[PDB]
Amino acid sequence: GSHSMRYFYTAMSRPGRGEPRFITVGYVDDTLFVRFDSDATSPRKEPRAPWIEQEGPEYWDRETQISKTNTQTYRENLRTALRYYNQSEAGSHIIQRMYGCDVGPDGRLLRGYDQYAYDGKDYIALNEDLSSWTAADTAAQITQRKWEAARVAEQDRAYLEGLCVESLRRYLENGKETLQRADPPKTHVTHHPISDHEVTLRCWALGFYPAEITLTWQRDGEDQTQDTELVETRPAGDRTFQKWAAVVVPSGEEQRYTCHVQHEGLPKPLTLRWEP
């Protein structure tokens, strides 16, 4: 179906403990495929997925250089941010960036992204039109003015419509065994007596990929959204994810509850119930 490629940057200052650390991780959908850490013994882009290993040595040298240059540029970005916000050089600060593209089943660009944050808050972001910007405050507005003057959006757009989609398409083909395979969730409902008046029904979804999934409990056909405990989807460590939804139900009324599961790896949504 649809696919995405995203690069995530994290630049962290640490006054008194050396220069700011710069990390980059790259993903195709929910699969990590490349990493870079300026604190590494010999910093360089490293493969994290089998299908990216075939990229030649030229690819790795070029990718590593981009990250090394980025390390220096983001340390300067951090210094600039301090000025824009009138902050002292004593505190630790963080700049983050997420950029990339989404493509459809046919491989055409669905939309591009280039978003930035400062200390966990929106800073500036490229609009979906790939030609204008949205600045979060008067500080980011200064960056916006510089970027509008330098036609940055036009350059981002060229990358997003070109190399971004072209490389993603190559990665999808080279990694079609995994990137183009959805693993359906293995499901089951557990029963845990709480007391004489209530019992807990927990609906499990395990071993699925991608991470996107919907788990809901219904009581007599009515969604129990407000009464369902939903844990955040979590990684199993073997590429797959896990998730569960629980509800407290009155003793003897277990059969009035049904768990519904939706996942792209499932031809049709599943309906489960406690099976004593």
Binding site: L32, R48, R202
Partner: protein, 99 residues
Amino acid sequence: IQRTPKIQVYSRHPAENGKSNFLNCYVSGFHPSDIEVDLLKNGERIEKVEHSDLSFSKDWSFYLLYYTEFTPTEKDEYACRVNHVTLSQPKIVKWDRDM
């Protein structure tokens, strides 16, 4: 502002005593990125624990997975100890094979 980490302790595969598995501690939704995580066995820290590469969600909050191989038993107790600038004292979350 700062955001405190959410914590989940669990196994990669269904728990079965005597069977080798992987013990996971997933921390997420936190900011800033500095965080200290230990996996414990009967209260003692397990050595050589590995963790994922720092990444973050759409809301900019960070997430990391700490993991190590382990063979669950009936007696042994496992937990995850987490400290972050937002926490006054390390937070310990026990492993419950039903969570």
